[PDB]
Write a protein that binds this DNA or RNA. Structure first.
Length: 49
DNA sequence: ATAAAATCACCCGCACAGATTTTTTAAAACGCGCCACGGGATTTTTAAACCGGTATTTAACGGTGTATGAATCCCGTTTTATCTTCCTTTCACTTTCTTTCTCCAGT
């Protein structure tokens, strides 16, 4: 990400064909330990953002 | 008794780096609820396989001239095995305090 601006969204696609959309401004500032962004189930992993 | 050589505590102001100590904030959680979404049972439509044929497009092959992979030699990096140590602990000993038992001079 070059910079955070406007109200663009983030598209997340995992295995088994599950999609999810979230606003970028949520990830504007993060601490040393990050926050939960997706509730994965069983053996599922993010493949594309 | 004359010579050679050493060591430490505190007071007064001021500026700053580092170590606790509250205080605020964002993430995680719980309870309740409702409607968005996916399952199941019909209609509908279209993606790809199949017959042709033609017209290109690729890969295998035969010469030259390099760039690099394995081997060797080192030196900083991190692990692991290996020493010494100060507080916890009791404990037999020693010391020190408290009560008691006589002596004993005086009348």
């Amino acid at each position: 990400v070059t910079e955070f601006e406007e109200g663009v969204k983030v598209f997340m696609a995992t295995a088994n064909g599950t999609v999810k959309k979230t606003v970028l401004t949520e990830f504007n500032r993060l601490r040393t330990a990050g926050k939960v962004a997706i509730k994965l189930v069983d053996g599922d992993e993010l493949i594309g953002v």
